[PDB]
Chains A and B, each alone.
Chain A
Amino acid sequence: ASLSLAPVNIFKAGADEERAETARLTSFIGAIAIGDLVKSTLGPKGMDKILLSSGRDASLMVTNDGATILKNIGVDNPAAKVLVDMSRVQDDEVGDGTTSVTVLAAELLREAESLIAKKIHPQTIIAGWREATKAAREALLSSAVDHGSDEVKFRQDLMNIAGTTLSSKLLTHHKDHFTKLAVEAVLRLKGSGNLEAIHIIKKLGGSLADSYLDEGFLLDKKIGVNQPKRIENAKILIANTGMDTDKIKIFGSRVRVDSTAKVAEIEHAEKEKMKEKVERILKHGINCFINRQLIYNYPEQLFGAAGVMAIEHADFAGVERLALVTGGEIASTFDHPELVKLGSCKLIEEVMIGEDKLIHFSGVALGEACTIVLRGATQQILDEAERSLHDALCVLAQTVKDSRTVYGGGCSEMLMAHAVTQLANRTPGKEAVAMESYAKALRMLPTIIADNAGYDSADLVAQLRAAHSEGNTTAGLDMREGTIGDMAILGITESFQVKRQVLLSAAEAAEVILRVDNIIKAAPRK
């Protein structure tokens, strides 16, 4: 019989059990809905979405980022939830491919629906899809190119990859500008992959072209009251001390006396303890002092009398970035100054950005940390610019780690589909049919890229398919005029890491969604 359509229902009031065809129906319609939602943001000519949340705040976002779009939607289909998590994982692993993986999974599931309608078991389909994924992996890896050795060619690949990542986003208006920023911002890391080092400040006002990459560093904290405001040849002590009514960690300690005179003596002793702490600090020979924690009035006064600029309430992130950009050591003990390394910068001044004052460190020593000032006309523009810059920086970091590149513009997808087709036509059985469907989805990726611009997607994908069958493994879409061209010459290159992750995550999620023949929901809590 069946679990639900049985003479007796075996479930609590509110639960349910969708069977074979109904389960595949809900799964396919949900996944394909998700995919058709997140596409149209795909490619250089992709358009943005509004995320008009209905919460008590009604936050408003304008995004072309597939990961954000899927995170910020109330989904109730479980297969759609799977695709959502897949896009989140793509965003975690690398910074690009969040829309391509979703569209790819949705297209694979569409083709799988077509095949199941053809009376094909959803095991033979996954078998063929695994074989096709293998073939595609080999074709991708074999087509990948590495240029990390030649520094100039590597710079060219970094500029081209940043350009390809920003083409799809709102920054394509000033792509070259932000491209330079993004490249410089990752090259200031000197091999490190710490993206927390790259701080992005969003200042409302000004055009998006007024954005820049500070040659030094910027801090949104305050200087003390009676303390200097400008410092040349600055020697800096970065600290994580108390300096805020700093109490001895003995917690049972209590002042118990018989005379207010002794209470006053002990208060004076507390103040003398704080003064000796400040003096131990000054014995480092400094002009700037940055504390992760607060700095109360008395140490502020002491630092002011000493002629030291004491910046307070920097965060863990602020002190880490300062250590990276200046060279100092985050310290909490000052009894061995010979061991505490100081930071150095030619100049510390106060600068105006919009209507706010910030501490500007110029002439920094190391530079392995960055500050990007993003200007914009609307907070939505600023948030989308930060998201796009994060995409570009994440991809450039992933490339600095692994210089393997693979040409874009649909060249890679068409090539993988070509390999899958070669495999398919030599294979006997319905697995060949599922391989052909895998190839159709791979081809449907550049099809969508072309559709989003308004070109003859069919004509162009036919030209590209013919080129990749002929052996012109570098043919791709030239989206300026709407033709086919050489991605190697036009500078349309992607990170091999990103494209491989797209392929594998999409195929894997489609596989897990396709293995389902029953959806047993439990009575919702709500």
Chain B
Amino acid sequence: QVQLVESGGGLVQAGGSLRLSCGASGTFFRINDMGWYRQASGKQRELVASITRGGTTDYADSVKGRFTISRDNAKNTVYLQMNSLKPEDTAVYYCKANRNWGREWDDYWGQGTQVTVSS
């Protein structure tokens, strides 16, 4: 019903900065909240941060103050600019979208973007 695309990747430790986007399409009439999640191998998915329609953003505890999550309502998309990258920030980044009154059967997840690494 809700088709979700994510554009990300490109880990860098030289200073550390990345930006990952998430765009939604399909059948709905409102995206109440958009959230970024992290899932590592052998870890439990957590919430990086999340933004509401009114722009109100709530950050997480292990990482905060370096967040540039911004929501374009004109196209119902979101962009996370995260800096100070580190090895434990290397995981799969999932997008979350609550729609149409925000019920428990309204959360729509993305396929997740794993952040590559060189060798």
Query: Quick check: do A and B touch in the complex, using CB within 8 A?
Result: no
Q: Which residues of B contact A (CB under 8 A)?
A: none
